[PDB]
Amino acid sequence: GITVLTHSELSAEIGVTDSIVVSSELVMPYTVGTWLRGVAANWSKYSWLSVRYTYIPSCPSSTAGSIHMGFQYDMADTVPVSVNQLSNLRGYVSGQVWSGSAGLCFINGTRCSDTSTAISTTLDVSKLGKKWYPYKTSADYATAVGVDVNIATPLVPARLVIALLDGSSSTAVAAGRIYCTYTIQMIEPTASALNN
Amino acid sequence: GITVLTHSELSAEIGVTDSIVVSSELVMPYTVGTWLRGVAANWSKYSWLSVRYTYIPSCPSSTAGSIHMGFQYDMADTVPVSVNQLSNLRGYVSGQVWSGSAGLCFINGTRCSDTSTAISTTLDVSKLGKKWYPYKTSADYATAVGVDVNIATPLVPARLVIALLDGSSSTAVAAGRIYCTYTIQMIEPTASALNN
Amino acid sequence: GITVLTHSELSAEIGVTDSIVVSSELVMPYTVGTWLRGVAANWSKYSWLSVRYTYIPSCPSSTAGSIHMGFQYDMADTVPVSVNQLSNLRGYVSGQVWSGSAGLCFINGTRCSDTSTAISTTLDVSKLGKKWYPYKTSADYATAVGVDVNIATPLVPARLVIALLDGSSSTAVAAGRIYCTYTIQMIEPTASALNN
Amino acid sequence: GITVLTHSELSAEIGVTDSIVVSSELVMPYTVGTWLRGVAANWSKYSWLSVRYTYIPSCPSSTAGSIHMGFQYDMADTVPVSVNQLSNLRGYVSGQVWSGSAGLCFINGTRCSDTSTAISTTLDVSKLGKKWYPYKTSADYATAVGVDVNIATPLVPARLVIALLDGSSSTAVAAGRIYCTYTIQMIEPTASALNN
Amino acid sequence: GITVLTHSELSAEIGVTDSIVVSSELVMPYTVGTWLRGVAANWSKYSWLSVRYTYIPSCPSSTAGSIHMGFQYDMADTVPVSVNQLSNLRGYVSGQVWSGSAGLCFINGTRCSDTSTAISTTLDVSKLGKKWYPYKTSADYATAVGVDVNIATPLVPARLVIALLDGSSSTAVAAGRIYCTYTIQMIEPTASALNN
Amino acid sequence: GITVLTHSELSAEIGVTDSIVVSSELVMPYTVGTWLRGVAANWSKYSWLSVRYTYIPSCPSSTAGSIHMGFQYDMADTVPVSVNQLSNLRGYVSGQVWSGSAGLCFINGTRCSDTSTAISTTLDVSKLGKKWYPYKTSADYATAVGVDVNIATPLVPARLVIALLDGSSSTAVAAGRIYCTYTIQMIEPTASALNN
Numbered sequence A, B, C, D, E, F: 001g002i003t004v005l006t007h008s009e010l011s012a013e014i015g016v017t018d019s020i021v022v023s024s025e026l027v028m029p030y031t032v033g034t035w036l037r038g039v040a041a042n043w044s045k046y047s048w049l050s051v052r053y054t055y056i057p058s059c060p061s062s063t064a065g066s067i068h069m070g071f072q073y074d075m076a077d078t079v080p081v082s083v084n085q086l087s088n089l090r091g092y093v094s095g096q097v098w099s100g101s102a103g104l105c106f107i108n109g110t111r112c113s114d115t116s117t118a119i120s121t122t123l124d125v126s127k128l129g130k131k132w133y134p135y136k137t138s139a140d141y142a143t144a145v146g147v148d149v150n151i152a153t154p155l156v157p158a159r160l161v162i163a164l165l166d167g168s169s170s171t172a173v174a175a176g177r178i179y180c181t182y183t184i185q186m187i188e189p190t191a192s193a194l195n196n
């Protein structure tokens, strides 16, 4: 009763400043993107066969700045505050805010060789707490972690932390965007209106 | 250290009215029936190798009404309120309140062919959040979900929702009953008095 | 880039009167049911690997009436007005309004033998005009056929005509319902908001 | 009676501004380019064995801006209005307005490895409504969709939507151009003067 | 559920004048002949496994005139106005108004060798827009193309254009006739009275 | 990305009195010992390939007293209060407070035969709720179970309960100590300062 789906989609718009800015995003259907959010809601649970966040630039080669990404798995753990700490994470990747074009290969689904430069990273998937996670909505998840953060580990597999710095302006400069490419298995359908 | 057991037992008495009535039952040792409840309490955790709820009629062929069953896996999800929504669920089955005799085959354990008409449904089991669940008691479970519903996913694999309607009276008419047939693996024994 | 999905869902509620009543439903994602309607909208086109409408009773064995189903493929063709005409159609099935329980086998997905009595019918699929059809919405389709019915053949594969008669009352009596079981291939994803 | 032809040709000139600009082009012989337009007109119908739109830059590495491409198949569907929506489409590709040189490989017909960075995308072809489409002219097509958009699905296989933004000027800056590389099968010759 | 049928039948009476006269006939069950018209109406859709129009003479060897035939596939395309244009068409054949006797071989169904002289032509069949077409009636088809010609491509596979000239009189002289030999697959039966 | 490590370490000092004293310890990296606590903190999650608690004596053969050990898996379950209840647990072991020297074999890592007398016990490991658990700190864990005990099952695999009695004094007499020998798989590194 598995419905397998492979798709790429926009995940976040990216900008750079001269001071470091750290952020994180949950790695669950509801938050990766608007498309998958609407689709996955029609199923009770899901499993990540593959999830990869890849950064694609949209700025001039003269643009100052660098982007950093990595994964965390215990939402209770505190979020990195420096490139140093972030570099220790699983799947850590780093690159110039104007580099990463080679990552298109993964999004397009096409097969390619020159990937060395790609600012793209993939999830363990096989090392996650469990295989089948329940589809959650921000609101519901929010309330849960509101009671206690640990209530989250059985609700979400991991979070992607991002850091942007080395920019030339104190005012964000659009650098590019992060796309999410995934192969998800969705099971146990439900009327979407009932899925919290 | 596994103790495997296969047994059938009464789960619920069923009645029909002219207005739809939706209910749900947790799919855990403690709530499937009085027998298994007492037995499983002597073990710390368990796993469902097979769990099937099957409806058996006890009324005349002239009895008005229909029965509906399906599964949900995220206790946080809201319970169906209409046959339409319920029909989307995994393992959805529907039938006349006086049909379903063929389901006896499964309960009796005997091998049979003419199952088409059986108002019986089985759990994914292999698609549950995890394999080994802790034996819980209503009280303990109740308190947990009282704090937050999501605390439930790591405590119970699924819930069986039931709907009854199309009856001819506004006053429930005994139609039949739901029996649970299961093959459960029980592990890590404990003095029952300590199992919450 | 195919996303295959197999699912059963409620399609229509059925009632009987003493005078014949003929109706028809388009066999496209948008109209088979509310669930698939929402899901399929996220893809540009689709293909039916299998589509079957099966009637399940919910009334007493004493209920008067019979149900009739068949398929038509040229929306320009006029709809049958008598059981006689309807009996000529592809996939024609007929049965007592209280029979058809055996059809549950198909919905449940389970394997069964005693299907003889099932008031269920399946689509040619391999004999449809084409394989890949565009996802359409009632409104859009309506406007198209408003200009000319033939504009419909490249938009929808077929329609299911239904007839109900032999009832004992002039006022509809709830007899049962038609469920749709399908295996659909969905391709070329799109933001649902853009799908007309 | 098939006449197979493989050729690359200029499809569109591209410019960038600081505000998003979305456009689309039909994927049929008449509109891909002036060359194929004149050639294909000598045949009644055709089939796409392969069609790929690839973007080639002509600006400095310092040029601000990004280009976006994807496919739609139901001309009745509304055109994307944001990068987000566009990213959901089949064959979606994105890149800096000054990147994409690697795509030359495809145009030249030569065999190459370092394609990762290529801002190029190819059509399903095997998932199109049908295989053989009639050669149409803008005028004729225009009149048809004027009556009703759906009259288009049996006349054209798909449309390529394009989006340009992230530029530094409100006045378009020439960034590069889109070339179309195709392998088309042309059948049933006709005097070109008669082909509408 | 396919009903295959092979049959020959009269399609049109032919006459010649000293000025060219061009005409065309749709290649669909309803218009090839009175016999097939009545038969095919009992089925919803059909497919041409083989369709051949063959001219048989009935005049003296001294009769002046020549006959010309060819196929067109986009009803929107304008009809040829000269032998020159017509000669470009698929399946173009030409011959003296008193020649063509050898074509009898095809009609009779018998096997023959001396076919060189036969004024007979066959349809691509495998290169048609689609395989299964809906049975249409002149009236319905007429109304459709009345709205827009293109609505026709999904309703009919092709048209046979005919040209007659080189006659010795300005008043038509009976030369012979065109017979249609076909192998058609008919599917999805329907009461003929409902087939439009 | 797995870092496997096998090591033995001191877990607890043991003393005996004439009245029974029951205690328990969580079976997670942070609490087994000071060494592993510091090491494992550098990784996000871990898995127990093998965990064994073994008691080693340090008293005279004349020392009165006995030691008892067993495992529990649902932290919500109440802790045993008598040897009788404790004897029902998984991995229950019992022995004289001055026996158990043979257990050294396991700690030393060396291979040995005369293990009969060893007061040592090992964890199911394969029957735990899940395989990969998040590294937790006492404080964080404490707060979680403070909200609700059940929040613990997805944070810790099991607890080791210990009982000491049959001593000759009401004042604890140092009997020996419990060492923990484990083979742990650590994954997804993190800066230790961030691990809660």
Ligand SMILES: [Ca+2]
Pocket: A044, A134, A135, A136, A195, A196, B074, B076, B077
């Ligand atoms: Ca949910």
Ligand SMILES: [Ca+2]
Pocket: B044, B134, B135, B136, B195, B196, F074, F076, F077
């Ligand atoms: Ca318990």
Ligand SMILES: [Ca+2]
Pocket: C044, C134, C135, C136, C195, C196, D074, D076, D077
């Ligand atoms: Ca659409």
Ligand SMILES: [Ca+2]
Pocket: D044, D134, D135, D136, D195, D196, E074, E076, E077
């Ligand atoms: Ca044309």
Ligand SMILES: [Ca+2]
Pocket: C074, C076, C077, E044, E134, E135, E136, E195, E196
């Ligand atoms: Ca028709």
Ligand SMILES: [Ca+2]
Pocket: A074, A076, A077, F044, F134, F135, F136, F195, F196
């Ligand atoms: Ca942690």
